[PDB]
Amino acid sequence: KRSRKESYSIYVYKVLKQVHPDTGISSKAMGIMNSFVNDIFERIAGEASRLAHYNKRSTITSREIQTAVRLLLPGELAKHAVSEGTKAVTKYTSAK
DNA sequence: CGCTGCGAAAAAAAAAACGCATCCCGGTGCCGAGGCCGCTCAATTGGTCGTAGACAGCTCTAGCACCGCTTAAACGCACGTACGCGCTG
């Protein structure tokens, strides 16, 4: 048929339907959301990595992703992202 | 005479007429979203190994107080000049 290009578009849909259940999203914009995710992936991973290296750690922990997010994101956005991030970690650990 | 009243006359200014552009209404029609079909490869399980990082301390650096001598800046005020600021043609 054709090779398989991955995305984030299905995970954007799910989050869109959670947030505005009566709303669609044009291809062109779904692109722009994809780009966005990808951009803010590379940025948090990047700074995460730099943090690890700078401190001689070979392991990127949640602790790095957290500090990455505190450096990249502005005050309010950071707080929440730190909160939604910590929440997710706790609820994953406790599930096993 | 002065006052005044009026009658312009002069703008103001208003109003209103015109005509133009921006909105919105309601029925077309087209295409891409959104939703199914299979299906395939990437995530999960579970479980083995070995080493990154947590800790418990051991060292000696280097960063924080205190302390007067000695200046070179700071504060500051007064006087005056060059510049910033605004109006017009």
Swiss-Prot record:
Q: Which residues carry this modification: PolyADP-ribosyl glutamic acid?
A: 6
Chain positions with N6,N6-dimethyllysine modification: 28
Where is the PTM N6-acetyllysine found along the chain?
Answer: 56
- Per the UniProt entry, the glycosylated residues are 83
- Modification type N6-malonyllysine: residues: 87
Modified residues annotated as N6-methylated lysine in this record: 87
Sites of Omega-N-methylarginine modification:
57, 63
Give the record's PTM text: Monoubiquitination at Lys-5 (H2BK34Ub) by the MSL1/MSL2 dimer is required for histone H3 'Lys-4' (H3K4me) and 'Lys-79' (H3K79me) methylation and transcription activation at specific gene loci, such as HOXA9 and MEIS1 loci. Similarly, monoubiquitination at Lys-91 (H2BK120Ub) by the RNF20/40 complex gives a specific tag for epigenetic transcriptional activation and is also prerequisite for histone H3 'Lys-4' and 'Lys-79' methylation. It also functions cooperatively with the FACT dimer to stimulate elongation by RNA polymerase II. Phosphorylation at Ser-7 (H2BS36ph) by AMPK in response to stress promotes transcription.
A GO cellular component term found in this entry reads: extracellular space
- Which sequence positions carry the modification called N6-(beta-hydroxybutyryl)lysine? 5, 56, 87, 91
UniProt modified residues of type Dimethylated arginine? 50
Q: Which residues carry this modification: N6-crotonyllysine?
A: 5
Residues where Phosphothreonine is found: 86
User: Sites of the modification N6-(2-hydroxyisobutyryl)lysine?
Assistant: 5, 14, 17, 28, 56, 79, 87, 91
Question: Mind listing the UniProt keywords for this protein, alphabetically?
Answer: Acetylation, ADP-ribosylation, Antibiotic, Antimicrobial, Chromosome, DNA-binding, Glycoprotein, Hydroxylation, Isopeptide bond, Methylation, Nucleosome core, Nucleus, Phosphoprotein, Ubl conjugation
Query: What is the top-level taxon of the source organism?
Result: Eukaryota
Q: Provide the positions where the record notes the PTM Phosphoserine.
A: 7
**Residue numbers of N6-lactoyllysine PTMs:** 14, 56, 79, 87, 91
Q: Which GO terms describe its biological process?
A: antibacterial humoral response; antimicrobial humoral immune response mediated by antimicrobial peptide; chromatin organization; defense response to Gram-negative bacterium; defense response to Gram-positive bacterium; innate immune response in mucosa; killing of cells of another organism; negative regulation of tumor necrosis factor-mediated signaling pathway
Q: Which GO terms describe its molecular function?
A: DNA binding; lipopolysaccharide binding; protein heterodimerization activity; structural constituent of chromatin
Entry-annotated residues carrying N6-methyllysine: 17, 79
Protein family membership:
Belongs to the histone H2B family.
State the oligomer form and interacting partners. Answer: The nucleosome is a histone octamer containing two molecules each of H2A, H2B, H3 and H4 assembled in one H3-H4 heterotetramer and two H2A-H2B heterodimers. The octamer wraps approximately 147 bp of DNA. Heterodimer H2BC11 and H2AZ1 interacts with VPS72 (via N-terminal domain).
Name of the protein in its database record:
Histone H2B type 1-J
Interval of the full protein contained in this chain: 31 to 126 of 126
